[PDB]
Amino acid sequence: TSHCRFYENKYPEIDDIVMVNVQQIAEMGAYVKLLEYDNIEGMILLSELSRRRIRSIQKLIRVGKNDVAVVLRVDKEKGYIDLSKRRVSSEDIIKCEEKYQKSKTVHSILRYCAEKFQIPLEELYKTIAWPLSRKFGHAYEAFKLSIIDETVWEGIEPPSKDVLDELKNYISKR
Fold it and tell me: Where would you find the membrane-spanning parts of this chain?
């Protein structure tokens, strides 16, 4: 449709560095959404927001803004996810931002097709993006590689040869 998770796994793994958007700041901590996992809910309790004891949170974290966090716990039965901002090194922030930007581009591209050819976005991910990602590490890389090498598309069975062409074609411009 118009939204779908970036990766194959529904939930992130522990120790994963995810990009998040801060929805609000409660008394227990911050509520955020995982931009890369179709906006599922995640929490960062106070002691994990920083070392200091804020007692004036809206000062350190600004609502509506993105941020980087590490996954500490994941309860798949209830859908709860515990994250930390504290523990993220400055290097992790840079790596996370780079990956997100790439995943964002891939998504934006696949979205173009999803609409145009009127097909469910998740099918394209399952049929193009993830498989390519499984082979070249990240779909974004495969897309760039495809520009200079057709052998990339080998094995990929799109929903219809028609879409694959519009894709090959779209990746070219810009």
Answer: none
